[PDB]
Amino acid sequence: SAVMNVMVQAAMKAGRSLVRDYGEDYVSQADRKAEKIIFNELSKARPKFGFLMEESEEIIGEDSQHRFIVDPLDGTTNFLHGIPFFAVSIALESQGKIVAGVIYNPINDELFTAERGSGAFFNDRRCRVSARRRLEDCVIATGMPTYLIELRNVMAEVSGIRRFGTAALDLAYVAAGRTDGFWEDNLQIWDMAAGILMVREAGGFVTDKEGGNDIFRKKNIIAGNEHIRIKLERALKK
């Protein structure tokens, strides 16, 4: 779709800039530059669309019902440290519903896209959540915010825990079937918006920690395939 292509292009241009800055305060700069590039691209492409970008005053668009939701650099600490795991995330929200999302890991050149009703793609092939049915078989990703109890709970149950230091990339990974599930607390809307669509379009399910749909409100998330998501929920509550 036309808007998807604009989103992808913005993300890739931001991505190239990131890789270039990754090459070399300077992290804030890299983040700010990626953001400028995305804003410029998406503004030029959709001048009446709103913008919700990480830690930045929301721009209400002339077209009040469409806004891009952006994390120009997801995995900032990874980025600061030289850990080649971070991503650009752009979601499009239309009428309060996420309808398109791009997560781009510019180091591995890994493009995750989904549009509502179209499925999720990992570089132009359909990707799907994993088919695992038991936690014992699972690699679950997580991020730092009771957390220790949850961690203990899940650690007891799973084959392995990953903590990559990204949110959006982590969701892309569940959506691509690379990890079997994800949970995190204190996540922002831009951390999650494209990833949640990705997971759902990949045939997974995404709830808040309490198993509902107040993700953006509760700032927390459990994602995985239907089976893993429920058991994760169970494990987390124990």
Q: Could you count the other beta carbons within 10 Å of the beta carbon of residue 116?
A: 15
Q: How far is the CB of 238 from Mg ion (least distance, A)?
A: 32
Query: Closer CB to a second copy, residue 176 or residue 221?
Result: 176
**CB under 5 to 8 A by kind: which of a second copy, Mg ion, none does 216 bind?**
none
Torsions phi, psi for 214 (to 5 deg): -100, 50
The residue with its CB nearest to Mg ion is 71
Which alpha helices (H) appear in 46-142, and where do they start and end? Answer: 76-81
- If one asks whether residue 29 binds a second copy (CB under 8 A), the answer comes out as no
Specify the residue, 87 or 175, whose C-beta has the smaller distance to Mg ion.
87
| Contact of residue 54 among a second copy, Mg ion, none (CB under 5-8 Å per partner type) | Mg ion
Smallest gap, in angstroms, from Cβ of residue 115 to a second copy?
Answer: 23
Binding mask 178-217 for a second copy (x = CB under 8 A): xxx-------------------------------------
Closest CA to 183 of 152, 208, 202: 208
What amino acid occupies position 15? G
Residue with tokens 């994993």: 130
How far apart CA 13 and CA 53 sit, in angstroms, is 17
Looking at the Cβ atoms of 74 and 115, the one nearer to Mg ion is: 74
Based on the shown chain and the rule CB under 8 A, indicate whether residue 27 belongs to the binding site for a second copy: no
Residue 61: left if φ>0, alpha if ψ -120 to 50, beta else—which one?
beta
Q: How far is the CB of 148 from a second copy (least distance, A)?
A: 5
Helix (H, G, I), strand (E, B) or coil at 59: strand
- The Cα–Cα gap between 128 and 151 comes to 26
Between CA 94 and CA 66 the distance in angstroms is: 5
Q: Choose the stretch contacting a second copy; rule: CB under 8 A; options: 54-62, 112-120, 156-164, 189-197.
A: 156-164
Chain residues in the site for a second copy (CB under 8 A): 77-78, 81-85, 107-108, 110, 130, 139, 144, 148, 151-152, 155, 159-165, 173, 176-180
